[PDB]
UniProtKB/Swiss-Prot annotation:
Record text on subunit structure and interactions: Monomer. Interacts with ARRB2, DISC1 and ZBED3. Interacts with CABYR, MMP2, MUC1, NIN and PRUNE1. Interacts with AXIN1; the interaction mediates hyperphosphorylation of CTNNB1 leading to its ubiquitination and destruction. Interacts with and phosphorylates SNAI1. Interacts with DNM1L (via a C-terminal domain). Found in a complex composed of MACF1, APC, AXIN1, CTNNB1 and GSK3B. Interacts with SGK3. Interacts with DAB2IP (via C2 domain); the interaction stimulates GSK3B kinase activation. Interacts (via C2 domain) with PPP2CA. Interacts with the CLOCK-BMAL1 heterodimer.
Name recorded for this polypeptide: Glycogen synthase kinase-3 beta
Function: Constitutively active protein kinase that acts as a negative regulator in the hormonal control of glucose homeostasis, Wnt signaling and regulation of transcription factors and microtubules, by phosphorylating and inactivating glycogen synthase (GYS1 or GYS2), EIF2B, CTNNB1/beta-catenin, APC, AXIN1, DPYSL2/CRMP2, JUN, NFATC1/NFATC, MAPT/TAU and MACF1. Requires primed phosphorylation of the majority of its substrates. In skeletal muscle, contributes to insulin regulation of glycogen synthesis by phosphorylating and inhibiting GYS1 activity and hence glycogen synthesis.
Localization per Swiss-Prot or TrEMBL: Cytoplasm; Nucleus; Cell membrane
Entry PTM: Phosphorylated by AKT1 and ILK1. Upon insulin-mediated signaling, the activated PKB/AKT1 protein kinase phosphorylates and deactivates GSK3B, resulting in the dephosphorylation and activation of GYS1. Activated by phosphorylation at Tyr-169. Phosphorylated in a circadian manner in the hippocampus. Mono-ADP-ribosylation by PARP10 negatively regulates kinase activity.
Keyword terms of this UniProt record: ADP-ribosylation, Alzheimer disease, ATP-binding, Biological rhythms, Carbohydrate metabolism, Cell membrane, Cytoplasm, Developmental protein, Diabetes mellitus, Differentiation, Glycogen metabolism, Kinase, Lipoprotein, Membrane, Neurogenesis, Nucleotide-binding, Nucleus, Palmitate, Phosphoprotein, Serine/threonine-protein kinase, Signal transduction inhibitor, Transferase, Wnt signaling pathway
Taxonomic lineage of the native organism: Eukaryota, Metazoa, Chordata, Craniata, Vertebrata
UniProt source species: Homo sapiens
Reaction equation(s) it catalyzes: L-seryl-[tau protein] + ATP = O-phospho-L-seryl-[tau protein] + ADP + H(+); L-threonyl-[tau protein] + ATP = O-phospho-L-threonyl-[tau protein] + ADP + H(+); L-seryl-[protein] + ATP = O-phospho-L-seryl-[protein] + ADP + H(+); L-threonyl-[protein] + ATP = O-phospho-L-threonyl-[protein] + ADP + H(+)
GO molecular function: ATP binding; beta-catenin binding; dynactin binding; kinase activity; NF-kappaB binding; p53 binding; protease binding; protein kinase A catalytic subunit binding
Keyword Nucleotide-binding: yes
GO CC terms, sorted: axon; beta-catenin destruction complex; centrosome; cytoplasm; cytosol; dendrite; glutamatergic synapse; mitochondrion
């Protein structure tokens, strides 16, 4: 059993053949398949989307921490866009769920590795003005043996342009920045930093930090930890907006007693009401929570070497070039 399609590399079209196709995922966009290519025997993921920005964004990206677009083709009385991506066996969500179900917390070495690679992938997309707008554990692909993380699902991604409005009802509820809940249309790529902060907090906690039962109750869940946002914080989130009045809960008492203090400190700097107050992805990479990753003697728990973490390009460093000396340890 073989499927042959006319596909373009992720230019000149060509006959692409694959076998062992099976459904692995399902969403509003359509289906996600796992298949094996004929020429190399390599496994691929095929994202089939019924019927704009995704393909254009996916074709521009070339980073170690972003899912690689191998080929693309249109198929099947309704037309679908099929994105052929290099297959990655796991997700942060599935790994975190296994630990959660077994009443265990993910070792902080993995939390450091996954969060650092997510921030690096964010520093790269934000350098082109591209905001992902769907940062959640499910969109963080993992190779369990090498601990290499790949950001995926650019279906909500948009190149943000100052002055031009954007939809407020975006991102998965639990990872939705408070300005979006307040109905902001002039938000920045800092919405992804809030989502990344929600992912970190979830990896430390064993469950989502803000589990809202609606897009409105989502703000109430944030208030239960961060306290009520001040009038100034509300103005910085959405100036057009003219909420229970309670104080912030201590950050240390949010997480289990033995949670590393640097993890707690990083959380507080990402989960800020004021969007501008939140760390940029590059500053997050530089945080003391990622110190272990800069140690020359650092290894993965299986004894293997950690992935290449400090091979930064001029593009990733463009937001703050003098950060390079702090980010790149002397051994690298
Ligand atoms: C919604 O968008 C996507 C969804 C997936 C990918 C993808 O890309 C490379 N690998 C995958 C992938 O799904 N791997 C399997 C991960 C674990 N798993 C889940 N169910 C069974 N196993 C890409 C895009 Cl863009």
């Amino acid at each position: 059993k073989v499927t042959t399609v006319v596909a373009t590399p992720g230019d000149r079209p060509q006959e692409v053949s694959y076998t062992d196709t099976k459904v692995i995922g399902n969403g509003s966009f359509g289906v996600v398949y796992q298949a094996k290519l004929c020429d190399s025997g390599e496994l691929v993921a095929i994202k089939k989307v019924l019927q704009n920005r995704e393909l254009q964004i996916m074709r521009k990206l070339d980073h170690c921490n972003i899912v690689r677009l191998r080929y693309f083709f249109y198929s099947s009385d309704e037309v679908y866009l099929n994105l052929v991506l290099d297959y990655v066996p796991e997700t942060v969500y599935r790994v975190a769920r296994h630990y959660s179900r077994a009443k265990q917390t993910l070792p902080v070495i993995y939390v450091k590795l996954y969060m650092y690679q997510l921030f690096r992938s964010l520093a790269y997309i934000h350098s082109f003005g591209i905001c992902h707008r769907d940062i959640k554990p499910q969109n963080l692909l993992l190779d369990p043996d090498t601990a290499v993380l790949k950001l995926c699902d650019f279906g909500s991604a948009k190149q943000l342009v100052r002055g031009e409005p954007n939809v407020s009802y975006i991102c998965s509820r639990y990872y939705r920045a408070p300005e979006l809940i307040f109905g902001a249309t002039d938000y920045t790529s800092s919405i992804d930093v809030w989502s990344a902060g929600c992912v970190l907090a979830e990896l430390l906690l064993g469950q989502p930090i803000f589990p809202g039962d609606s897009g409105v109750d989502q703000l109430v869940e944030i208030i239960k930890v961060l306290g009520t946002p001040t009038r100034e914080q509300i103005r910085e989130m959405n100036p057009n907006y003219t909420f229970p009045q309670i104080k912030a809960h201590p950050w240390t008492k949010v997480f289990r007693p033995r949670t590393p203090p640097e993890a707690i400190a990083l959380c507080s700097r990402l989960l800020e009401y004021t969007p501008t107050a939140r760390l940029t992805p590059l500053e997050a990479c530089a945080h003391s929570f990622f110190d272990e990753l800069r140690d020359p003697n650092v290894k993965l728990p299986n004894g293997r070497d950690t992935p290449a973490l400090f091979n930064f390009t001029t593009q990733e460093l463009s937001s703050n070039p003098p950060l390079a000396t702090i980010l790149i340890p002397p051994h690298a």
